C-alpha cells in the first residue's frame, strides 16, 4: 500500500506518466489480497488454539475482536475502492491521450 501510494502521488503530480499510475493501482489490490490472507490466517490461528480447550468443564473461555481489527478490516474496503478508481484513472488518461 505504501509503494502503491508512492507511484500514485508522483503519478498525480506528474500526470504524463500513465504507467506509474496503473502499476501503482495493482499494489492497492495486492495489499487487499494480502490482507485477506492476513485476516484468514489470523482468525484460523485463533480458532485452532481454542479447539485445544481440553474440554475444561466448569471453566470458560471468551474471545472478542477490538477496534484495531475493525480499522484493519475497513482498510481492506478502502484499498480495493482506491484500487479500482486508480485503474479508472488509467481508463480515462489512456483514452484522453
Amino acid at each position: 500500500m505504501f509503494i502503491g501510494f508512492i507511484l500514485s502521488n508522483i503519478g498525480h503530480i506528474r500526470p504524463h506518466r500513465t504507467i506509474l499510475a496503473f502499476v501503482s493501482g495493482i499494489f492497492f489490490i495486492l495489499s487487499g489480497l494480502s490482507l485477506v490472507v492476513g485476516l484468514v490466517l489470523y482468525i484460523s490461528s485463533i480458532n485452532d488454539e481454542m479447539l485445544n480447550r481440553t474440554k475444561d468443564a466448569e471453566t470458560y473461555f471468551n474471545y472478542k475482536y477490538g477496534w484495531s481489527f475493525a480499522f484493519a478490516a475497513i482498510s481492506f474496503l478502502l484499498t480495493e475502492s482506491a484500487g479500482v478508481m486508480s485503474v479508472y484513472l488509467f481508463m480515462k488518461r489512456y483514452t484522453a491521450e
Binding site: I43, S44, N47, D48, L51, N52, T54, K55
Partner: protein, 268 residues
Amino acid sequence: GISIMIKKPQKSKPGVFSFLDPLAYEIWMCIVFAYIGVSVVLFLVSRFSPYNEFGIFNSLWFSLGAFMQQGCDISPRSLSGRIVGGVWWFFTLIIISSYTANLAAFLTVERMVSPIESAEDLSKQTEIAYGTLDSGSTKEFFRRSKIAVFDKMWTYMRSAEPSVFVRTTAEGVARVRKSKGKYAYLLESTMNEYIEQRKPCDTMKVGGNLDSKGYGIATPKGSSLGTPVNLAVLKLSEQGVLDKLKNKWWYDKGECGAEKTSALSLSN
C-alpha cells in the same frame, strides 16, 4: 500388568485441505482426470462432423462450468455432443450430492479414534515418544525382554533423546497431559484405570496388558495367618467381592462419568 497411557484424543485440528475429507483422495483424482477425459472427448466430437465454438479451450470451460453446477453460455448442438454433456451432467449431480451427504454425516456423528491401540503399533511409530520410570520394575521389564516387540521399544528409549525416562509417576502423567499427544507413558494398568477416572479426565488407557503380574497379601514365613488368609482371598474373589470393591473405588468414586454441534469456524 504394564499398559500404555496416552492423552485422550480431542476433536481435531482442521488442516489446510480439511474440506477434501468427505470424498477420498482417489475420487478427487478420478474427478480431475475425468474432467480432462470429458473435455478431450467433447473436443474430438465437436471438431469431427461440425455444425465450431467448441475448441479445446471452450471444452475445458464447458466441462468446468458443468462441474461447478453453473452451466455456461454455450451448449452442444449435436446428438453426439449432447451425450457427452448429458452423462457429465449426471456425474456432477451424484458427486456433489455425495459430498454434501457425506459431510453432513461427519458433522452429525462425531467419532474420535486413537493413534495407537497396541504396543506393536507403538513400536513402528516415531512421532510419539514413549516413557517409563527411571528406576523400577517397569524399566527393568524392557531391559531383560527378548521376545519381539519389547526389544524394539527398549532400543528406542535406550537411545532416544531428550531422555524420555521420567523419575516420578506424577511427572510422567504430567508429560502426557503437556506433550499434546506426542508422549505415551507405560504404567501398571491399575494406575492407568485410576487416573483415567480422575479430573481433568484428560488421559486414556489403550491396548492390553503387556505382561502379567499380581498383588498379594503378605505374611511372615511361618505365621498362622498364612493359610486362612489364602483361602479367604479365593473366597472373596469367587463371590464377586473383590470385583465389587474395585468398581466402587475405581469406577464409582471417580469423577469421569462414563453432541454439541459447534458452528463451522473459519479454520475448517
